[PDB]
Write a protein that binds this ligand. Sequence first.
Ligand SMILES: Nc1ncnc2c1ncn2[C@@H]1O[C@H](COP(=O)(O)OP(=O)(O)O)[C@@H](O)[C@H]1O
Ligand SMILES: C[C@@H](C[P@@](=O)(OP(=O)(O)O)[C@@H](C)N)C(=O)O
Ligand SMILES: [Mg+2]
Ligand SMILES: [Mg+2]
Length: 306
Amino acid sequence: MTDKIAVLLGGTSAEREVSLNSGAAVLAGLREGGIDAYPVDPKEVDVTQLKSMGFQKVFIALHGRGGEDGTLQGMLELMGLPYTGSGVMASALSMDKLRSKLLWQGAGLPVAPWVALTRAEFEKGLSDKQLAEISALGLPVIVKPSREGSSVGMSKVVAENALQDALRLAFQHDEEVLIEKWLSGPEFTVAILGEEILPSIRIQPSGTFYDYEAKFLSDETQYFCPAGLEASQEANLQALVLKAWTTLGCKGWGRIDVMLDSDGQFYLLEANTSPGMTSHSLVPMAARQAGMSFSQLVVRILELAD
Ligand SMILES: Nc1ncnc2c1ncn2[C@@H]1O[C@H](COP(=O)(O)OP(=O)(O)O)[C@@H](O)[C@H]1O
Ligand SMILES: C[C@@H](C[P@@](=O)(OP(=O)(O)O)[C@@H](C)N)C(=O)O
Ligand SMILES: [Mg+2]
Ligand SMILES: [Mg+2]
């Protein structure tokens, strides 16, 4: 019987394997909840044919450029297919950490001190005063590609001596890079589903930072849901995250990453518009604590599609 939902997974970004795992999860969750869901991989299928195929809605489970940057949402807007998550502007804006930062800081929101570099400036040689602005950040510092996820392309540099290799790795993934002040932690994440914010999660990695391996591969990562903060701080977290969410213009569902620093204040890291839904993912963890089943959450996200 009529009513086909397309579940977009895989893709070609550096987050492809993670996305196939998020898709597998969502496909079962949706079917368990009575939905006639179909797995569609844009690397295999021409998604520009989604409408000619009979699909009524699209559940986006892609991660990274191509699925979270607004291009895919742009097409679906012209094709007329309701879809999950944020619109074109919010998605394009959330993917770019340098631009989410300008926006956030411009709105008065807490963002860690940073320096942006383009591959060109890097190739030409860092005009030494470049280093003067980077050393003013203090050490250590964190280097990250502007448009990535899953800790791809990042690294920590203790002392200016290590900066070159770090920048060379980051520029392999993007032409625009950020170098930001290293925050002490702990680290937090806060998921949003519609007009509601789920209970906070505090992440605790075994190594240097929450890397690729700590996110999807090791059983050493600890999580605490709720965070364990006093109501006063738990309150401050939601207020911040909600303002971060609305300034960006996001909607549907998402997850914002935050961290504490030595001055006892919260700092925005980034916002993700199409979060992971694998067995190691944070969003499913928060919903569980909020009393929902994996099926319920997924079914709810699709309910929010527009
Ligand atoms: N300024 C920072 N200071 C300390 N750790 C950071 C900082 N920025 C990022 N991290 C760490 O790096 C991880 C990944 O960075 P994030 O900005 O959230 O990008 P991604 O989209 O790859 O997740 C974070 O979860 C955290 O563990
Ligand atoms: C660990 C996290 C990953 P992810 O949602 O977010 P990050 O950008 O922080 O990795 C990612 C897919 N883009 C999760 O699946 O919940
Ligand atoms: Mg991210
Ligand atoms: Mg993150």
